[PDB]
């Protein structure tokens, strides 16, 4: 089983390793033994479906600060912190007209997402590890 001997379009034999031609069948079997042939041979989803959704009533309290909102959530009894994210108003269940603003929504696993619309372009940062906190002893969520 030599992977270098092939058949051309003229009824001949072609060795692609040394790039040689042979007319008859007896010249291809004798071209494997030699110096040039030996030299050429030597050179070469589960967490989303299991999430309970009862949608309780959230309690958010906003306050205009100057240099922040406080969301009161019940005991979740888990290590998963509620995450906040800023999205656009272009995607909706009914898609209302004149939707050209952004909304920061905070979501948890046993509770529903609470969203607040921001008419301004950029006045704060919606990052989770930068300016957010979640006290599990008092179960108080804050984001500034």
């Amino acid at each position: 089983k030599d992977p270098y001997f092939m058949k051309n379009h003229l009824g001949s034999y072609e060795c692609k390793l040394c790039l040689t031609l042979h007319n008859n069948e007896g010249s291809y079997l004798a071209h494997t033994q030699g110096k040039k042939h030996q030299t050429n041979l030597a050179r070469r989803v589960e967490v989303k479906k299991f999430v309970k959704i009862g949608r309780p009533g959230y309690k958010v309290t906003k306050q205009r600060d100057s240099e922040l909102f406080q969301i009161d959530y019940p005991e979740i009894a888990e290590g998963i912190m509620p995450r906040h994210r800023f999205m656009s108003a272009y995607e909706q269940r009914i898609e209302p007209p004149d939707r050209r603003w952004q909304y920061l929504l905070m979501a948890a696993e046993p509770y529903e997402t609470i969203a607040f619309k921001v008419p301004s372009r950029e006045i704060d940062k919606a990052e989770g590890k930068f300016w957010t906190h979640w006290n599990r002893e008092t179960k108080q969520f804050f984001l500034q």
């Binding site: 989303k48 949608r55 998963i80 994210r85 979501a107 997402t113 969203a115």
Partner: peptide, 17 residues
């Protein structure tokens, strides 16, 4: 675990109170 839980939550259930 927090990155897996944040990438699997529903971001279309918006509620403004």
């Amino acid at each position: 675990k927090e990155r897996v839980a944040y990438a699997q939550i529903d971001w279309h259930d918006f509620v403004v109170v």
